[model samples]
Target chain A: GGFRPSRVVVVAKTTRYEFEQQRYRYLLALKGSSYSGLLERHHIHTKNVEHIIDSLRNEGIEVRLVKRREYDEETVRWADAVIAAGGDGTMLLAASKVLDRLKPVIGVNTDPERSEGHLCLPVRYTHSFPEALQKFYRGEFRWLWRQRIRLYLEGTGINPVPVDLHEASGPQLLPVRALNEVFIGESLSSRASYYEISVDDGPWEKQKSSGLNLCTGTGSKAWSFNINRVATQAVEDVLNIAKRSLPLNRELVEKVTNEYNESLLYSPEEPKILFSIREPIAVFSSSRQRCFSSKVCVRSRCWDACMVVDGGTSFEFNDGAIASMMINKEDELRTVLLEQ
Target chain B: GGFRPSRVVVVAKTTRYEFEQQRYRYLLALKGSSYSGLLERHHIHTKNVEHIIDSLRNEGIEVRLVKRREYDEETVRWADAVIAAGGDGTMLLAASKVLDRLKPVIGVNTDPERSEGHLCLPVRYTHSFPEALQKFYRGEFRWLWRQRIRLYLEGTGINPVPVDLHEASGPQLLPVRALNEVFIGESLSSRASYYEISVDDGPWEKQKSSGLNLCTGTGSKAWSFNINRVATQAVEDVLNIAKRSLPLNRELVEKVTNEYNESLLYSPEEPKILFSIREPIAVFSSSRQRCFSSKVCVRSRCWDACMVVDGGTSFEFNDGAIASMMINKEDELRTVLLEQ
Candidate 1:
């Protein structure tokens, strides 16, 4: 069996020097102390990523380093495999760029402790970068197929009419793959928003709430968990109230409580997607509706709203804006994960 | 084309004689006139359904009339095709019985004006029942595949596991095909309820709301529409309040109003479901979270909650109960729809 990867593209997260400098200056003005710790740590992470790239080059593999912001089609299409260097955020950025072609992605978590590395390979801080690369080359890893959610926006330039022009000319869909979740909500956190939502081609129902969330299996552990936790607690409070006021049967209460303990976690290979609406308000006129489906369409009723993808990219979601989301198994990403 | 459908099961709604009589007696007690109109109308409908069965048998097709309440596995399994006589409620009842086998269902709308026959064939009271059967036999009807949502309940006798005996034998999953929608809420209308909900395998969040609804494309026009309508109205109220107090942008408000006018209806062929929470309350302790996904798991937090399927069947959903819902395209019912 002859298998080899020749051309490799390394997508590295850039140091936020300008933003860090601004923060450092603000701290110096307020407390007369420089906050240079973040800047130095970022520099060290960049150097480590470079060391890994050099190691790959020495092993007879052509490696190209592309900064996160400088992602282009030509550079992405030119590679056989792509490596994302940094935490889950950088991985999401890298994955978004390669979603169209569905190139295999390998994630290297730089600061695992500070950030979640859900999609990254099992390479620890103490591990040598050169050795890890060598192991990956030697096939000492398992390939995990992770699903992604595709978001189609109507009344937006990301996927405008004249399909050929959108595909060949520029980004067809902004941050195409929702690796974690896509959040559709009001720009201002305090205000409630409105929208009509439907699954597949079902009837549109009006919703009065703070926001809605559509997420992939990969993103389930983050925001989804928080939403679910809050919902569960609400139910628990109701149960406690019911028990104190009403003469509830013990057997029935026990049965319901036991069912609540079961875990609802998504597998990487699951073709389905998950969505949640945050701070949903149901008036006498509007009700709360929830579902699990492959395709979800939400038409905004609030003029000042936004659709944020993976908490990394944000797009304007004005009134009459429609966001259609679905999971396509055919466009799944293959990633290498070292077994623990 | 060789088409021969033998052993057809005709599922008909029973005459509402008892309920009608009880109402008549009550009205008589309250100084009412003769109330024989409803009784006469129901009898005529029952006879009409029987007439359709006789017509089927006259055409050399073996037909058996099964009252809605008397539906059993043997009768469903014996049929090559099934015909539901009456209205949408009757169709839902017949469909739920035949969901396991995925039998082709042909719905005959007995009273078109009175019922929202969304799933019924294009047959009205004026249309001859015999003529409709002839058309169906003559292949003048299109086979419309309507998707259904399957709900699996845990921690109850409906699907109890074996520390006892229910799980060891028979299907552990209940007869839970949601033709229109599955409503999980309080038995009482005014009171709030609690539950934890999750999409796909996301984290569970608690919800303090009136109820949660999961609707199929077919059911979107009913409960889902109302929920959406209420939510949209709530937003409009907020907008009006904001306009009175704050300086809002005119362009933004216009855009939102325009988006609210778009129609939200599910297509018949869509293989997905929509879910919403009714009257979701966001307290400081309980945050609002809603989602759209293919697999929704909701565990009850109240001792007196109920799960209503298609507005026909009601099950006891007390505390410590879990209802898992998903769309199963493979189990879709092939229905006959007369072309408009």
Candidate 2:
């Protein structure tokens, strides 16, 4: 009588061999050579995917496989729970499709050694596949409610008012929810990008930077850590130079330099998001050039800028186009994790 | 009948004339001059304190004044709510004494132009004292549950367990809570400090730096902003140099650097703390040297260090002493704010 998933959907990444053969055969045929590199790296993932399906079926759990490209609402609605059966990449793809569905996802890392699977359960790597599946079915896992960052195009006449997740639908402003982060930057990385940025309805200031990223708490560990690492290193360098500059007013400098350097990673329950502008070119001609914000609004100053969510989906953000990124207060992604 | 504070204690900073005349009279005698500099800056504060006390008494509210040094449990126990008159400094002093009391605080910025009163209500500057008191008594203002950082000395066999605020008592480890930030650094400005740092039970790594700061969300706006400013500037300088040094790997670097650059300020409701290592000197001999952590544990390697809380209370943290700083999970400071 309680909530138990009747049908489970398994979403796995296509094997590199299968992907190349289907999508890049024309180029491969011209090269007339075997792509051994792809097979060497992805063979384990392909085998693991098969093993997961077979194990679930043997356990009498009804299972269905949904390929990355074939993912649609109708196919997903048939399942009560979803299993992302590759790495974080596959999990991200599954999340994109499962947005606002309120389904519990189980991420199983296929290749633990080679893949960055912070979101994956330890069951696949530690326990036998059958045992892990049995434990999952027996309700011996915990649910982690991870917050997601939602990006919406502003000035499209779509009401910016908060909407209920269950009732959200239609040709409203295109909304993309990301479990990790959303990247707004130049389509071509070599080029400098320009945008006007604001936060929480604050004044917009011109920003000439390489790009910007907004990350949820779950995403803070990876990309946010790297950004903070570089910044910390730069602070050390500047401190070394400043110390040697003069008859040091150590009191004033230390007062200004004093800060808590902890990388900001909130608990999974916090609805707040973290954002940073990459290599911001500071123009000191005016006092208005300032730092970035959490609830960010960005207006693209050039046609070359693009908005990428979770490093997969890309949307063109041309000149005069404005977009806002913030925490999705209306929805969250729930995932299952083996209790530690 | 509902949420009315019957006894309100007014905690005020000692008047400048009284403080200097008693403590700095020897220096004043050597100079052979009356120092009116103190009076010029603090006269408004002295008058405001009188106004606050008179206003509360006129409203039939039981009122008492406690000087900074005279603050004690017996004195504070009489008050249902504590009013900090003057500025954030006075509030910090009051909060120090009010720890574990579960009493509400009302901060009045006596000199709004000179004082940085992010924690204060606008009652003193914009409205009559009586009007503010009446509103507070009527429960018309909002209560901000401000998170505070608690530090404990490790290896003292002082159990670092979270204790309920109302129930906390006895000669346990010395615990101090900061509304803004707690600074751990050298007692002298010219000398560098050495310590071993760890985060959330992580490995201890040797760090040589100017100092370290641990800040709550409330402190993020002031000290954290300044630290981030220097860091951001340093990052800009490094980026400029890196651009000229070689064919820029702009794509990968920018991808990692793109971040939400807003100063990390949590709502008063958040129980997370931020820590930053000021001018961290990285020793790359091993993979052990890291920058900072949210929940930090530090062991002093030398006797020249001091831990200052809210830039006011100072504790000697010498060699062989281990101290840990983290969010106080069990208690919070409830502050009164004017309804916006």
Candidate 3:
């Protein structure tokens, strides 16, 4: 393996609130710290980095927290690896900060299931922060890197837009980079209307839908995708949703018997009306007949709805609409996987 | 056991979207006369229903859409038990509807780990609608209910409230219940800060923190309780928060560890802390921390940020502010489980 010792610096990115909570817990754990000689081994600064210090100290580990302004190439030069401590967004920025170093980054999911641990693919460990840290120190974790999808403006000669510059570049030129999927769907209130879809130089069909979801193997289990258990199914089946029709059970089964009875005699007719124009996505396909629709039950409301990638990032589409799509094993996401 | 076959109607409370999706799938599974039979059963008034029927006919299943207003009474009259075909809320309504019939209602959780299925303690079946139905028909399920805590407000009523209304009108004017502990905290966000908490006619402590949580053994794993597992500890160290301190890690760990280790280190410190309050149906607490005080890594934020119930309901609280609370076993919910 072309393994390189990471001269990378680990930066723990976390929210102020989380920082506070960690500080509280750290103070409590510190009660036993002196007895264990634990507090002295690490930098335990509760006034600011108390939480981080406690985390490392609890596991007999050590790390330094330089101020945000002090973060520079020199900081990167001191270490072989960097581990960002926040959700997917923070990890993404942290990963990019040292990407040129080519040092593999390890993102510790301080908050495992809520924030998109996009870069923290293959969660090293779940549960308490201390437990996760303990495992990390014991060499129980490894770094995993999934392919990234980068978006670009057609005319702009720019590459993937830096997150910091995203807001500055005007909304018209949207560039997104994810270690998972890119979801394009409708607003929370409305259903995804009709949209044309084309995959890799293929013909397009104008398909009617309530939402559009494009996912990668890594992010298949995140958010709404996990709800439908769609991620657990074969990726080919998910992609072929536009092709097949689901069976209705009314006449195929006997009325008295709740089972499908093919012996029941009946007429068989298929609708064959032609349309004036061929759309890019096939909305009227029989396969579109799913079991659950966007309903107002406590379980299936469309309110606050949006597309979630790898169960990490969510973007709101203004209306129930989407455009064409191109997918394959080549681009950024190399393959889709079924959770074993 | 005086439990007998009662008019336990299982209301399948689902969204029109889910119903329609299933209708489409059913249409694809039926054929000829069977499809027409289904149309007769459900009474297709719109093109949507008719199209669904036609689709089923093409699939070879016959459907008879019988015209009926409320499937509740009609279905109950036709059977010994009713199964609601939705999540916990639907099940609650159904349970209340037929409570007088003295029948135990069963619920089908269309989506688990995402809905309020936590409240439907017994019928926690995790499967597809079709599969769940098949099991129900085959008599392959059990009924389980926990000892719950209930409360009666002097005029406004119980805090957090109970599902069954009939049980609410009992003699106790201010009865509080707890399958878990009965919790009484601010309903809507208010500015006036701290709450005075007491235990069993004891002096109250003015805790400076967030809202409070109460729980019974049934709710030990629910939102209000935090269970910590350190190393290979066979049993989890449970801490019931009468109030949420600042999500300060130092404070939290100190409070938790103080409460935890004290019980383990000295046999005198009771693991359970009881609160004494007036109109004393249940105990209450508050939060002095920010709403986003809880820190979670990106990938695992959802699980930590939300208030998760057993079956699977996650509630998000408005930031910062704390409350008062008490914990006792003889709360109102005992009526549901006790042998009256």
Candidate 4:
């Protein structure tokens, strides 16, 4: 129950799995043709003894295989630890399942130099699968407790208390979800829709605009940071500019938001939906609050659009409705670390 | 007809006129007031050569009493110049009429040190007025032109003509005239409304926000400039931190509108009609474009809300409905002369 390092199953999509296998030499296959198969075969061939097949294997370290099909709730619950092998997309998939369960996760990034990898632990230059395993066995790894936002929605007209849902709106929703932001806009090659805006419970006005956006503290750096212009230049360069001008402060951000709110006026509370009037008449919302702590809710017209989770997986909405998410922190399938 | 020595006139409004009369040594009074009577009596007493009924005989300066009731089209047409003495509000009233007729104006700041007079020419200083008057007589004063914007209605379905109409789905059709900008949003107490954003002819998406805003190039320095964190501090002293952090910029402002358009997937070439959900919906559309521009269209449920021009005026729908506005600006409104 304490800190038991068991068979850590790494799951990734087909492309990412193949890419990881090709890129890292130490990532040995345990089963047949597929990476998962190779991984399983390796496990069986080692007579279930991790030490015989992998160098970093210790006395109790037993590598296992939970194919994509079997990587469900039960498997996730059973695993002591899970490693997400790929990019931020794969990592988010694993996190969605494992974040609530509080399972320790190691993110093995396929793209080393990208900003995505910076979200997790920084791997060493010469580090490989075996090296990662060695470090894991020796307890040389660090764990990060990421933050989550909760959402709350109060239905006015009807309901069996509509399931407070968090579903992906599209492929873009995945990245948006990962950043805890919502982008409601038109599809490519179309004109924008006129949307009515209001704040708290203020009056509504039509905004003949192209789209709308909302983000969380985690996503603040991705979307809000850009809006704030704080991230326009490199932090170092900004620091230099600050010397000549003025230093950056949260007060400015609040002030900007205040001014913006005064003009446009929207709210994160209520349904927290991002609706598009045109083609991509899509609406999506997300937050770390799985059960309303930092939650975001959205209602769309159809499932054909899709509810993209963490910019990776896509699921069709049932009956044009979805609500509420239950999160498990104790038995999550992956892990995450804060970026900044 | 060509470029004659432009004779400029300065007209002071109710309060400004009174302030100047008290502050500076100007003997100002209504058409039939005591001042006029005193001047008439004095002139009659000292009619050296020119016939005198009032102080109009002093130095042969022709001064007349014109009542507000008679202050009509003829009075404006007959005057060689017009002077407005007050804040921007008063100046707006005068400028809106005569400036288009190639008439020149002079604004005298009674409260020269106030925020209202910051951008205007201060004449409280004794030498400055005389010096400026001499320049005026010599036609040396610079002629600053007011920028203009064109509005159009993007008709659809049965009415597919690209009508150069001004009103669209708002309260009333007002000419899209603005010296600075056409602002669209809610009052301070309202919660931010969801806005769909877009740009050019692109897709639209929901921008999860609390408010919306649009400003012109002149307003860029007022709002956009302070939005810059560095510039905010630079513009204000330590004590003025709260005031300094509200500068505006083209990129940020454009993004706000573009995002709305993109969210709705609205086409840019299509005529855009903006609406304000609030009162004082500004309508500055032209007469030719009025059919599609006023709040009447919006109140008839033609669209959503109305729009405000320069944050002071608004246009609403006629049928007790409202229209929304998209912050549309041509390059002219975005131009600025700031040191990089």
User: Which docking class does model 1 fall in?
Assistant: incorrect
Error of 4 at A98 (Å): 3.6
lDDT of 1 by residue, B1-340 (tens): 2234788888776655644464457534221212456566676676677677767788789988877556766898999888778787778778877865347887777655554577786645225766666666687666778878887876543433211000012324656577788888874332357888887878888787768888887777766665554233323333443232324465544445334422335665687667777656653244432334688888776656577777666666766667788888776778766665
Evaluate fnat for each of the predicted models and list the values in order.
0.02, 0.00, 0.00, 0.00
Candidate 4 off by > 4 Å: A13-60, A64-75, A125-143, A149-180, A193-208, A223-308, A313-340, B1-340
**TM per model?**
0.45, 0.45, 0.30, 0.33
After superposing all C-alphas onto the true structure, candidate 2 shows an RMSD in angstroms of: 26.6
TM-score of 1: 0.45
Show where candidate 2 strays beyond 4 Å: A1-4, A27-38, A123-127, A156-171, A231-239, A242-261, A283-294, B1-340
DockQ scores of the candidates: 0.02, 0.01, 0.02, 0.01
Cα-lDDT of candidate 2: 0.64
* Model 2: DockQ vs. true structure: 0.01
TM-score of chain A of each: 0.79, 0.79, 0.44, 0.49
True contacts kept of 4: 0.00
Cα lDDT tens digits, model 2, B1-340, are 2256789888776655676567656844222123545565666777777777777788788988877766677877888888888777778778877775268887888776666677778745433787776676587877778888877765421233432221122323555677777777765332357888888888887776657777787777655544444333434444444332234354533332333234245566676677776545443222322233458888776545667777656666666567777776555787876754
Scanning candidate 4 chain B in windows of ten residues, the lowest lDDT window is B281-290
Give the alpha carbon lDDT tens digit for every residue of A26-133 in model 1: 534221122456666676677778777877787788988887556666788888888888777778778777764346787888665555577887656314666666
Interface RMSD of 2: 20.7
For residues B158-257, write the lDDT of model 3, one tens digit per residue. Answer: 1222222211222232222233333333221111113444443455445422134444334444433221111111001111111212232444544443
